[PDB]
């Protein structure tokens, strides 16, 4: 849900600073959405990307499985016998 991108080799290398896969670039500070369900934050030579799904946890994942679901770009868990009903959760991570 979240990892570090080092100006020592970041993909699609092209300012070497901190370019989109959009292909546009952007000012230091500055935040960017990508991928229409990613985020991340461009900095003097480093960059820190994050999703914008959030992930189940304390939860019975053995009665409740999770689905995933592009138009809201999140992660839902219902249970196996009755997919309508939603599973209980401890918490989200995001």
């Given at each position: 849900s979240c990892y570090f991108i080092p100006n020592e080799g970041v993909p699609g290398?092209?300012?070497?600073?901190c370019m989109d896969l959009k292909g546009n670039k952007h000012p230091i500070n500055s935040e960017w959405q990508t991928d229409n369900c990613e985020t991340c934050t461009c900095y003097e030579t480093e960059i820190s990307c994050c999703t914008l799904v959030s992930t189940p946890v304390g939860y019975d994942k053995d009665n409740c499985q999770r689905i995933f679901k592009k138009e809201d770009c999140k992660y839902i868990v219902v249970e196996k016998?009755?997919?309508?009903k939603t599973c209980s959760v401890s918490e989200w991570i995001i």
């Amino acid at each position: 849900s979240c990892y570090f991108i080092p100006n020592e080799g970041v993909p699609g290398d092209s300012t070497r600073k901190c370019m989109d896969l959009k292909g546009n670039k952007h000012p230091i500070n500055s935040e960017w959405q990508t991928d229409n369900c990613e985020t991340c934050t461009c900095y003097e030579t480093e960059i820190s990307c994050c999703t914008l799904v959030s992930t189940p946890v304390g939860y019975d994942k053995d009665n409740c499985q999770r689905i995933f679901k592009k138009e809201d770009c999140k992660y839902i868990v219902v249970e196996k016998k009755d997919p309508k009903k939603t599973c209980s959760v401890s918490e989200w991570i995001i």
